[PDB]
Ligand binder design. Structure first.
Ligand SMILES: CCCCCCCCCCCCC/C=C/[C@@H](O)[C@H](CO)NC(=O)CCCCCCCCCCCCCCCCCCCCCCC
Lengths: 470, 156, 431, 14, 47
């Protein structure tokens, strides 16, 4: 699924083994110096080896504090050590870098003159948020008006909105499935989905990432073998897939997945976290870009953090599914309602996207998010880099493959006034370290042109042009 | 200066600890580390090739045994210590026995001991040791020695 | 060689590609959800203009007892300036997890302010109130440990207890005699093992019963068996101590005896979020290995810039704390003579519980019985109250009842109007 | 005492 | 940077020496220089 140059797959294992060897050696001279209030230690000796022997070496590439709105250009605060690199502290000095590590695709995480004036007015009339849950006193009028805009937008009959995009997967999967069920998940699913599956009693299998000929062969075996020990019938089967598989940048093969789930009478659980304002000619997600009937999928989970510039989540489906969840979902019963100015800013963003604001800049954003991604991705391939994903996706990871290139590609770019994101080993597979580039609809062409020459010059030093240029 | 592209497939294996041992390039590095240690030993202190192969076989004993058969658990806290009563050898391949990658790891301590004996003229000063080392390695990797301990030493 | 082998059956003949097709056709799945009923679909009130003591529903003015703002900070004139000045300078969204670029400076200031308020080395923020317990407990307790829970802990805590695949044993609700029995029986079954970790999970003011935990016997039994204490003081932070510090200042114990202190800012601070407090080593370890901290968007900065102002208001004005005790006592002096209900809360917690006496039947029936009594309190004489809404995923088995979240902004007329209206309705429906 | 081992280990390998 | 200075930098990141401290790097560079001199001097005339 990823083409790896053979000579680089060898100098990566060597680079990791050298780190392992020096780390064990150094940790062996700490265990004999600890000779100099009775409870067990907070953490054992060797459960955080790669946290203190690999992460602390490059800890200045993460948790960079900014002091400006998440815009195309922000200010980055500078940090010193003051005690030989153990606890970084922040100065007063700042910079002015190009934002390429945020998520605001449509450029809503800013001050725009249709949403912020309405949200400020919906603040001084409702005071932040209610202190009760939604079934007691936290269902304001704004919370009832917003659950209609989401149903109109997404397309399904009814929807529920929560206040966290991570609790939208750990507090719902236990409700729909329980013990005796099955969950054929995709390999590269978020942590929230797997934690939600663990919170119930269901069994989890995994089919190969983004290929249906392997999804069929797993369903056949699992229905022909029943429960793992007492070969009862499987009470249910649910298949979980994602719209755009981030950190791989690929659009899912939805038409070929739904067709196989219908045949074996399994259910489908879609996850449009990255693809609900980005892809599509109207912004309706993958079910519109790929031309699939929205009633073939049973549940559709989403998130407003990335595109609409406001926290939250939702679930949409048949009108009895929503009635069941509103009566038996712990996140709906026990948790405080989503704040009011954080719901007005979703209402007034869906109005802009649908063009009901009077102006017509709801289509300029949708066109400029595409004419920027198709340009950046095309230009990176011509210089010989290795970028993944298709042509219609806001994310494009660049593969690095070497643990030592992670602090080299980031420190140079920050020094030349460009900010990016890099991902290491403990989170990713060992061999696949990458950098993630996020392109928004607020970047101008003059910025992408200037940022491509900064990247092309840094990529010569590290030698990450694995493919041949022209 | 880059050729020989390989299209690696992701084996699920759902375990950070023992999934990296399936991507292309592991065997070659495994052997090149051994061939690199052999040359570096007889450069920092000029000696006979036989002894140097002996020092390589003795260093490869402690490193491999302490890593594959002594340590238990995983260094990643994400799985909430699901594998606390298992060693790295037992976690491999979800407990599947006699696979392609287990036979390669079984076959190396033998072939490396043959080389350290055939160039040291057997004798007894080194023969006694090398035999003990290879014997310990091969016994520890037997299919029947699965989740079984010796007198309950480092067993629970 | 042979005289030692084991008898085995010959291997079976594998299924054919035709037989499998049949089995895949006989199999039938159950419905995704159970069929709906008519008692399953009651809509809650939709209100306007506030959520404070005096809200508004359908035009008529009702009196609120279901919002958990104890200090009456909803709609304070000093919070609507802070939020406004930070909402037009940062935006309304976070745009990223906190490890990549989601660390605004206001987050660091808020953490410093909270830690200075409680007097502790360091502190950590979380995005959402209910998820501060999903991720704190599985971070500390792994599969080989032992946790001594309280059998009366809400769903947030008891979801984390299940995620962290450890061994959980319960003890009777606020029964130090049953706590010490359990501690001894654990310190005997685990004798040779000494590297394992042991934790005690409690709650400052319980939400299902309104009873304050006694933090003297717990801090004393913890020093005798080498345990650790995790305290969930979301209902006591800012209301309970004499200066507002919480349970520790209530029982006059040093805060260093409590290993982890977690709270939610959605009750007495009039914001959203959560935080966790402790020494430097504990906090800096869960800043990297947590789950809801590294995989979730950070707090919107306008919510974290209101917590700072709220804490400053609390610190500068300790009179609204005694004004709350008076209101709780005033509601207790006008409700002790009810007919079928029974005040089963503590005398100081601002959650006036009311257990129903002489259970009318099965718990299923009692739920709707309480639901209609709660419905008629609003429709007729304009009163919002809360009734126990259990889920089928919850495992708590405490008695159900009706709560009343008293605040510090209630008047003296509405406070007794809440008592007369409950006495009449309880009299004319239960007995 | 030198080729019995090298002959038996080949058999063991196979 | 010139050609030799650039080709040294490209070597530090490929074998993971860009991350280590000065004392971990000076203990490996010397140990690999020794190996390149030993191979040269011997193999150049031992055949
Ligand atoms: C200088 C060149 C190398 C110098 C010595 C390097 C030896 C280090 C390799 C040891 C492999 C450890 C396998 C499992 C270890 C587990 O116990 C622990 C905790 O459970 N897992 C982890 O820490 C994470 C699991 C994966 C991390 C492995 C990173 C190292 C990747 C290298 C593997 C492929 C290259 C070597 C193949 C196996 C090496 C065999 C030892 C060679 C002996 C050298 C003595 C001359």
């Amino acid at each position: 699924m990823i083409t790896i140059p053979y000579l680089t797959a060898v100098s990566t294992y060597f680079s990791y083994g050298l780190l392992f060897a020096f780390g064990q050696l150094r940790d062996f001279f700490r265990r004999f110096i600890d000779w100099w209030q009775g409870y067990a230690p907070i953490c054992l000796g060797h459960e955080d080896f790669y946290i203190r022997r690999l992460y602390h070496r490059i800890q200045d590439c993460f948790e960079r504090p900014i002091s400006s709105a998440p815009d195309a250009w922000f200010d980055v605060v500078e940090r010193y050590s003051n005690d030989n690199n153990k606890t970084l502290k922040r100065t007063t000095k700042t910079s002015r870098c190009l934002n390429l590590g945020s998520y605001n695709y449509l450029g809503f995480g800013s001050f725009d003159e249709y949403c912020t004036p309405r949200v400020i007015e919906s603040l001084k009339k409702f005071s932040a948020s209610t202190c009760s849950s939604r079934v007691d006193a936290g269902t304001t009028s704004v919370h009832a008006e917003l659950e209609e805009c989401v149903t109109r937008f997404v397309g399904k009959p009814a929807a529920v909105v929560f206040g966290m995009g991570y609790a939208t997967n750990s507090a719902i999967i236990p409700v729909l499935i329980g013990k005796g069920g099955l969950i054929i998940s995709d390999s590269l699913n978020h942590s929230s989905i797997v934690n939600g599956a663990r919170g119930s009693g269901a069994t989890i299998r995994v089919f190969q990432h983004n290929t249906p000929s392997h999804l069929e062969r797993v369903l056949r075996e699992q229905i022909a073998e029943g429960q793992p020990r007492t070969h009862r019938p499987w009470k249910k089967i649910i298949v979980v897939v994602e719209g755009i598989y981030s950190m791989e940048g690929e659009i899912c093969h939805l038409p070929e997945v739904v067709a196989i789930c219908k045949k074996y009478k399994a259910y489908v659980y879609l996850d449009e976290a990255h693809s609900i304002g980005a892809i599509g000619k109207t912004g309706k997600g993958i079910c519109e870009l790929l031309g699939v009937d929205t009633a073939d999928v049973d549940v559709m989970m989403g998130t407003f953090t990335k595109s609409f510039g406001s926290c939250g989540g939702y679930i949409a489906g048949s009108k009895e599914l929503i009635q069941y969840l509103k009566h038996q979902c712990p996140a709906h019963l026990y948790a405080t309602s989503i704040p009011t100015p954080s719901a007005q800013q979703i209402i007034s963003a869906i109005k802009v996207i649908l063009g009901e604001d009077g102006s017509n800049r709801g289509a300029q954003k949708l066109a400029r998010i595409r004419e920027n991604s198709n340009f950046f991705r095309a230009e990176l391939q011509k210089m010989g880099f290795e970028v993944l994903g298709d042509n219609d996706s806001p994310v494009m990871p660049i593969m690095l493959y070497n643990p030592a290139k992670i602090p080299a590609f980031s420190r140079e770019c920050l020094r030349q006034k460009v900010a990016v994101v890099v991902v290491g080993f403990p989170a990713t597979p060992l061999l696949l370290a990458r950098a993630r580039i996020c392109i928004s609809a607020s970047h101008s062409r003059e910025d992408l042109i200037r940022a491509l020459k900064v990247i092309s010059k840094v990529g010569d030093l590290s030698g990450i042009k694995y493919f041949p240029a022209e | 200066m880059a050729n020989l592209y390989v299209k690696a497939v992701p084996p699920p294996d759902m375990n950070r600890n023992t999934e990296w041992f399936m991507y292309p390039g592991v065997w070659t590095t495994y052997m090149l580390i051994l061939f690199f240690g052999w040359l570096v030993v007889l450069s920092v202190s000029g000696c006979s090739p036989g002894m140097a192969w002996t020092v390589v076989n003795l260093a490869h004993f402690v490193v491999t045994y302490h890593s594959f058969h002594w340590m238990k658990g995983t260094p990643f806290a994400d799985d909430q210590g699901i594998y606390n009563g298992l060693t790295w050898w037992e976690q491999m391949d979800n407990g599947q026995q006699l696979t392609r990658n287990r036979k390669f790891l079984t076959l190396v301590p033998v072939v490396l001991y043959l080389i350290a004996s055939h160039t040291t003229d057997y004798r007894h000063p080194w023969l006694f040791l090398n035999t003990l080392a290879v014997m310990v390695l091969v016994v520890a990797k037997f299919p029947n020695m699965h989740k079984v301990r010796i007198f309950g030493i480092n067993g629970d | 060689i042979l005289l030692t082998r084991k008898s085995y059956k010959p291997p079976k003949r594998p299924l054919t590609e035709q037989e499998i097709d049949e089995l895949c056709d006989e199999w039938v799945p159950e419905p995704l959800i159970p069929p709906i009923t008519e008692d399953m679909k009651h809509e809650p009130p939709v209100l306007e203009s506030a959520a404070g003591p005096h809200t508004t529903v359908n035009g008529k003015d009702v009196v609120n007892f279901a919002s958990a703002n104890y200090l009456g900070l909803i709609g304070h004139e000093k919070l609507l300036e802070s939020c406004t000045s930070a909402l037009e300078k940062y935006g309304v969204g976070s745009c990223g997890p906190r490890g990549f670029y989601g660390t605004i400076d206001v987050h660091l200031d808020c953490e410093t302010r909270i830690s200075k308020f409680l007097g502790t080395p360091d502190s950590i923020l979380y995005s959402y109130g209910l998820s501060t317990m999903f991720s704190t407990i599985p971070c500390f307790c792994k599969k080989g440990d032992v946790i001594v829970a309280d059998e009366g802990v809400h769903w947030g805590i008891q979801n984390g207890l299940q995620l962290s695949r450890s061994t959980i044993v319960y003890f009777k609700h606020n029964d130090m005699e049953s706590l010490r029995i359990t501690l001894e029986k654990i310190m005997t079954k685990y004798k040779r093992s000494k590297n394992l970790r042991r934790y005690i999970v409690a709650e400052a003011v319980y939400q299902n019963s309104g009873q304050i935990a006694p933090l003297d016997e717990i801090v004393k039994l913890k020093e005798k068996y080498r345990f650790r204490v995790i305290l969930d003081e979301s209902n006591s932070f800012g209301v309970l101590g004499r200066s507002g510090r919480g349970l520790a200042e209530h029982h006059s114990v040093p805060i260093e005896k409590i290993d982890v202190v977690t709270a939610a800012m959605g009750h007495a601070l009039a914001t959203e979020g959560g935080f966790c407090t402790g020494n430097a080593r504990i906090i800096d370890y869960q800043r990297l290995s947590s789950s809801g901290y590294v995989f979730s968007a950070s707090l919107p900065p306008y919510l974290a810039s209101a917590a700072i102002t709220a804490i400053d208001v609390i610190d500068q004005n300790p009179d609204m704390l005694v004004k709350l005790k008076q209101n709780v006592a005033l509601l207790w002096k006008g409700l002790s003579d009810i007919k079928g209900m029974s005040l089963t809360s503590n005398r100081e917690s601002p959650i006036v519980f009311l257990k129903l006496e002489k259970s009318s039947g099965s718990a299923k029936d009692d739920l709707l019985l309480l639901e209609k009594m709660a419905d008629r309190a609003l429709k007729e004489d304009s009163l919002l109250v809360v009734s126990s809404k259990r889920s089928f995923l919850d495992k708590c088995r405490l008695p159900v009842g009706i709560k009343l979240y008293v605040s510090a902004g209630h008047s003296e007329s509405d406070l007794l109007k809440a008592s007369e209206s409950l006495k009449r309705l309880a009299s004319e429906l239960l007995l | 005492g030198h080729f019995f081992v090298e002959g038996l280990l080949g058999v063991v390998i196979i | 940077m010139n050609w030799v200075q650039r080709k040294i930098y490209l070597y530090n990141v490929t074998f993971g020496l860009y991350m280590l401290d000065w004392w971990e790097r000076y203990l490996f560079n010397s140990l690999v220089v020794v190996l390149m001199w030993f191979v040269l001097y011997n193999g150049t005339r031992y055949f």
